[PDB]
Design an enzyme around this catalytic site. Structure first.
Site, short mmCIF file in Angstrom:
data_model
loop_
_atom_site.label_atom_id
_atom_site.label_comp_id
_atom_site.label_asym_id
_atom_site.label_seq_id
_atom_site.Cartn_x
_atom_site.Cartn_y
_atom_site.Cartn_z
N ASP B 25 0.78 -1.21 0.00
CA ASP B 25 0.00 0.00 0.00
C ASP B 25 0.81 1.26 0.00
O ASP B 25 1.17 1.65 1.10
CB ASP B 25 -0.90 -0.13 1.22
N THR B 26 1.08 2.00 -1.09
CA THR B 26 1.87 3.22 -0.97
C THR B 26 1.28 4.33 -0.10
O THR B 26 1.94 5.31 0.20
CB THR B 26 2.13 3.71 -2.37
N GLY B 27 0.05 4.15 0.40
CA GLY B 27 -0.58 5.17 1.17
C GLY B 27 -0.56 4.82 2.63
O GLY B 27 -1.29 5.40 3.43
C1 LIG Z 1 -5.39 4.51 1.48
C2 LIG Z 1 -5.70 3.07 1.80
O1 LIG Z 1 -6.98 2.88 2.43
C3 LIG Z 1 -5.44 5.49 2.66
O2 LIG Z 1 -4.38 5.86 3.47
C4 LIG Z 1 -4.45 6.74 4.61
C5 LIG Z 1 -5.62 7.13 5.21
C6 LIG Z 1 -5.57 7.98 6.31
C7 LIG Z 1 -4.35 8.43 6.83
N1 LIG Z 1 -4.26 9.37 8.03
O3 LIG Z 1 -5.30 9.69 8.53
O4 LIG Z 1 -3.14 9.67 8.35
C8 LIG Z 1 -3.19 8.01 6.19
C9 LIG Z 1 -3.24 7.19 5.10
C1 LIG Z 2 -3.77 1.35 3.27
C2 LIG Z 2 -3.89 2.85 3.44
O1 LIG Z 2 -4.35 3.25 4.75
C3 LIG Z 2 -5.03 0.53 3.57
O2 LIG Z 2 -6.00 0.15 2.66
C4 LIG Z 2 -7.22 -0.56 2.94
C5 LIG Z 2 -7.72 -0.75 4.21
C6 LIG Z 2 -8.91 -1.45 4.38
C7 LIG Z 2 -9.61 -1.98 3.29
N1 LIG Z 2 -10.91 -2.76 3.44
O3 LIG Z 2 -11.31 -2.91 4.56
O4 LIG Z 2 -11.39 -3.15 2.40
C8 LIG Z 2 -9.06 -1.76 2.03
C9 LIG Z 2 -7.89 -1.08 1.86
#
Ligand SMILES: *[C@@H](CO)COc1ccc([N+](=O)[O-])cc1
Ligand SMILES: *[C@@H](CO)COc1ccc([N+](=O)[O-])cc1
Lengths: 99, 99
Positions: B25-27
């Site tokens: 997950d790059t995020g």
């Molecule tokens: C992408 C995968 O679901 C989302 O990533 C993030 C969501 C929220 C935060 N945050 O609140 O810091 C960071 C990453």
């Molecule tokens: C990475 C960024 O925060 C996380 O991405 C996900 C979290 C949860 C789910 N889901 O419950 O389907 C998908 C992606």
């Protein structure tokens, strides 16, 4: 060109002309932005993440300018703490995860 | 080699010999797994995502085999609905987001 992941991969995107700072996220299926206004022509959705789920407004064929390209795609707006471009858009931009 | 993002980028990883299916997950800044047992030598953390935050157990220098490499890194365990390898590990693996 590529992002090396030592820093969060963030760009500026123009969505219907509005500038927004977005996180490019390979782990999101969807894109969800907040603080943009996009119409009353939406369908309600709820997307889940880590702490639970949120209510969103799904808008189709929105206009997006990012990385020197203008694409059209689905964007949701809702109370996300961070704006992300999910895989729905990263594919529109020809992005791959490389190693 | 690279993942093209038409499908979720999922691999199998061995964490302290246990096999787990993870989303790259790059995020995510962090990695968080569930259903693995890793020790009582952890520090408590709470990480936030879309629906809110969760309690995690941060474990340092865990042993991870993934994509033909054995790296060591921080892993958290907690009640995530999906197991992800955040940027803390993707950098250990030499992954870039390319376009
Ligand atoms: C992408 C995968 O679901 C989302 O990533 C993030 C969501 C929220 C935060 N945050 O609140 O810091 C960071 C990453
Ligand atoms: C990475 C960024 O925060 C996380 O991405 C996900 C979290 C949860 C789910 N889901 O419950 O389907 C998908 C992606």
């Amino acid at each position: 060109p590529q992002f090396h992941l030592w820093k969060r991969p963030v760009v500026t995107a123009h969505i219907e002309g509005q500038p927004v700072e977005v996180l490019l996220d390979t782990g999101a299926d969807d894109s969800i932005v907040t603080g943009i206004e996009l119409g009353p022509h939406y369908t309600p959705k709820i997307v889940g993440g880590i702490g639970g789920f949120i209510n969103t407004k799904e808008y189709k064929n929105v206009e997006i300018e990012v990385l020197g390209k203008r694409i059209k795609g689905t964007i949701m707006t809702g109370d996300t703490p961070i704006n992300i471009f999910g895989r729905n858009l990263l594919t529109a931009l020809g992005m791959s995860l490389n190693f």
